[PDB]
Predict the structure of Spike glycoprotein.
Amino acid sequence: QMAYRFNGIGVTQNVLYENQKLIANQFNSAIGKIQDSLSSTPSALGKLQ
Amino acid sequence: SNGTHWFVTQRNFYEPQIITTDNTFVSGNCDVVIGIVNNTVYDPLQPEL
C-alpha cells in the first residue's frame, strides 16, 4: 500500500522497496516526537479551550 | 498467484496476463527486496529467432 502511495506522488515503487527499513525508522521517530510536541507546549490546544 | 502460476493484472479488475518484458521493468539484484520470489519472465523476441 505504501508503494502505491509513493506512485501517487510521482516516485517509482522500487525506491520504497529498496529503502523500507530507513523509511520505517523515520516514521517511528516522527511519531515518537509528536507526543513531546503536544505535551511540552501548553498552548497547542487553544482553539478547543 | 493462482496457487500454481503467476500472472500480472490491473488493480481494480481481475484480468490475468503472462509476465513478459513488455509489462515489467528491471532494477538491481534480487537480494535487497524483502519477499521476492522466483519465476520465469517471458521474452517475446527470442522465440522468433
User: Anything to note?
Assistant: The helical segments of chain A are 2-8, 14-18, 20-40. The radius of gyration of chain A is 16 Å. The first helix of chain A runs from residue 2 to 8.
